[PDB]
């Protein structure tokens, strides 16, 4: 029931003729000067009850974000069985706004919430009636067997967790505990999954340098559960994800250029983050 701390308050301060003046320093030391206005100009006393609540890491990363959009089709044609379900790699790479926020840190540790927003429409003029469908989102951890089709045995999910949701009901939701192997997830990996040895290909590492070769959390397998209809219905899942109980380490610069791909790699057409100003003296 304690009052939370505020940002720095100001003591009334007179002007000075001090021979010890904080204005000068040596930034070369790696340390920032610490002047506050009372060290530079005359100031009044100010009671400061303002806080930094919205900038807490828990608040910063406290919003769900769309991370991926998956799509599947319920139809009845000979070439459509393969489209009935969608297998996707778990990652936050797919969407840039969340990725950029996470990239402020080198390492992070958190629990997650998964929320799924389902929608559907007709991709075909048949516009016929279909029944309300049940959809299944199954998680397949790495090394676990994967389905060959939407109608298979792996969908039994006897050990794998799986959620069944009806269209029209509240978006389904579940909590995932931190599942990293390390004591934090690494956002970056300056290394290789394996070390090519003397007896190897000169280019070895070309297929595995980076996080892309060590970060593997399995896939989500999404299918319509319902048997197919005479009338095709197109559906999709907007997967939302939110960090919770999150702490971070080792801050780094935010991305300045258009992302692209899985690594930090930029593209030649987007290596110019700033606008031009006609003059150094222009306001």
């Amino acid at each position: 029931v304690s009052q939370p701390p505020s940002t720095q308050s100001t003591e009334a301060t007179s002007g000075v003729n001090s021979q010890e003046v904080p204005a000068l320093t040596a930034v070369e030391t790696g340390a920032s000067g610490q002047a506050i206005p009372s060290d530079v100009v005359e100031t009044r006393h100010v009671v400061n009850y303002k806080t930094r609540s919205e900038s807490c890491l828990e608040s910063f990363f406290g919003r769900a974000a769309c991370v991926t959009i998956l799509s599947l089709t319920n139809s009845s044609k000979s070439g459509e069985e393969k489209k009935h379900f969608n297998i996707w790699n778990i990652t936050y790479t797919d969407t840039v706004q969340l990725r950029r926020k996470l990239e402020f840190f080198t390492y992070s540790r958190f629990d997650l919430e998964m929320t799924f927003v389902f929608t559907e429409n007709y991709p075909s003029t048949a516009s016929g009636e279909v029944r309300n469908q049940v959809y299944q989102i199954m998680y397949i951890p790495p090394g676990a067997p994967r389905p060959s089709s939407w109608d298979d045995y792996t969908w039994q999910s006897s050990s794998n967790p799986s959620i069944f949701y009806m269209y029209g009901n509240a978006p389904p939701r579940m909590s995932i505990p931190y599942v990293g192997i390390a004591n934090a997830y690494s956002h970056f990996y300056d290394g290789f999954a394996r070390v090519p040895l003397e007896g190897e290909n000169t280019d070895a590492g070309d297929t595995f340098y980076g996080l892309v070769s060590i970060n593997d959390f399995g896939v989500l397998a999404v299918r319509a559960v319902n048997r197919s209809n005479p009338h095709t219905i197109h559906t999709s899942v907007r997967v939302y994800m939110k960090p919770k109980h999150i702490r971070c380490w080792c801050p780094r610069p935010p991305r300045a250029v258009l992302y692209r791909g899985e690594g930090v790699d930029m593209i030649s057409s987007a290596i110019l983050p700033l606008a031009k100003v006609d003059s150094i003296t222009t306001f």
Binding site: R52, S55, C56, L57, F104, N183, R247, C248, W249, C250
Partner: peptide, 8 residues
């Protein structure tokens, strides 16, 4: 883990 950040 070194370098913990609490707030932006």
């Amino acid at each position: 883990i070194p370098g913990e950040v609490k707030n932006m």
